[PDB]
Design a protein around this nucleic acid. Structure first.
Ligand SMILES: Nc1ncnc2c1ncn2[C@@H]1O[C@H](COP(=O)(O)OP(=O)(O)OP(=O)(O)O)[C@@H](O)[C@H]1O
Ligand SMILES: [Mg+2]
Length: 223
DNA sequence: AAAAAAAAAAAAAAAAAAAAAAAAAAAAAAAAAAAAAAAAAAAAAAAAA
C-alpha cells in the first residue's frame, strides 16, 4: 500500500488526457452516468484545506450528494467508492450497518470492553464516509451529520467523557426523492426530504433523473 | 596403738528409656457486588377536523 514507482504515475500525468482517463476509470461496472463520475472523481481527489491564521477554516473536502429515483446505481456508486478509497467506511440511514453515524460509549458486544464507539463520521476522518439512503436518517443521525459536516468534529458528552474528536471526512451520500420519483417541476430542496442546512454543506448535487430512452435502455440492458 | 581390709558412701559421669513437650504450618473455592443488556409494559408527542 506504499508506492515505489512514482515514475509511472508521472508518465500518466503527462498524458494530457489523464483527466478523461481517470473519469472513465471510476465505477467501471456502471454504464453511463459520466457527470456523476466526474463529480465522484473530483471528490475522490479532493481540494485544499486551509485556515488563515487559525480562525477561518475552509474544508477541501468535496461532498457529493446523489439524489435519484430508484434503480439508478446510486448504491453501486457508493460501493465502488468504498472499494477504491483508502479509509472509506460505509453506513446507511437505516439500521442495517455495522457502523453508525453517531458516537456513543458502551461495552463492546464481542470484546466486553468499555469502548468509545466513535461514529462512522470520525472513523473516516482522513477519508470518505459513504451514507446510503441519506433521507431516511434519524433526528439524532441528522444532527450528527450536520455537526460533522459543518464543524468537522464530533462532540461527546456521554458518560464522564467530554471530548471533541475530529471528523474531517468527505461525505458521499445517496438519497431518494420525495415520493420515489424526482419531480423537475419542483426545486431540488423540495424533492429530497433534507433540510436546507444539510443540503448546503454539499458541493455537488447529482440529480439522477430516470427517463425512458430506448437507446440508453438497450445499452444498459446489454451491459 | 597402727596397720592393712573392706564396706558405705558420697560424686561425677554415663546410660537410658519414657512421656511429655515443642515445632512445623497456603492454596483452592466461593460468593457478593456491581455492571451490564434485554423482554415487556407503560407513558409520552407528533397526526385532523
Ligand atoms: N447505469 C447502470 N449501469 C449498470 N448497472 C446498473 C445501472 N443502473 C442500475 N444498475 C443495476 O441496477 C441495480 C439496482 O442498483 P442500485 O441498488 O444501485 O439502485 P439504487 O439507486 O440503490 O436503488 P434504490 O434507490 O432503490 O436503493 C444494481 O444491481 C445495478 O447493478
Ligand atoms: Mg440504494
Amino acid at each position: 500500500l506504499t508506492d515505489e514507482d512514482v515514475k509511472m504515475i508521472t508518465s500518466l500525468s503527462k498524458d494530457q488526457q489523464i483527466g478523461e482517463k481517470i473519469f472513465a476509470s471510476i465505477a467501471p461496472s456502471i454504464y453511463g452516468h459520466e457527470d456523476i463520475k466526474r463529480g465522484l472523481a473530483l471528490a475522490l481527489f479532493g481540494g485544499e484545506p486551509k485556515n488563515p491564521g487559525g480562525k477561518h477554516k475552509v474544508r477541501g473536502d468535496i461532498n457529493v450528494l446523489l439524489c435519484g429515483d430508484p434503480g439508478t446505481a446510486k448504491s453501486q456508486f457508493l460501493k465502488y467508492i468504498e472499494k477504491v478509497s483508502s479509509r472509506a467506511i460505509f453506513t446507511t440511514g437505516q439500521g442495517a450497518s455495522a457502523v453508525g453515524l453517531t458516537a456513543y460509549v458502551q461495552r463492546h458486544p464481542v470484546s466486553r470492553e468499555w469502548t468509545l464507539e466513535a461514529g462512522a463520521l470520525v472513523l473516516a476522518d482522513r477519508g470518505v464516509c459513504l451514507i446510503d439512503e441519506f433521507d431516511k436518517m434519524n433526528d439524532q443521525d441528522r444532527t450528527s451529520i450536520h455537526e460533522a459536516m459543518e464543524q468537522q468534529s464530533i462532540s461527546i458528552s456521554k458518560a464522564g467523557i467530554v471530548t471533541s474528536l475530529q471528523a474531517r471526512c468527505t461525505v458521499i451520500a445517496a438519497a431518494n426523492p420525495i415520493g420515489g420519483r424526482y419531480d423537475p417541476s419542483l426545486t431540488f430542496s423540495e424533492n429530497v426530504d433534507l433540510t436546507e442546512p444539510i443540503i448546503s454543506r454539499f458541493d455537488i448535487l447529482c440529480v439522477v433523473r430516470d427517463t425512458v430512452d430506448p437507446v440508453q435502455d438497450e445499452m444498459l440492458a446489454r451491459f
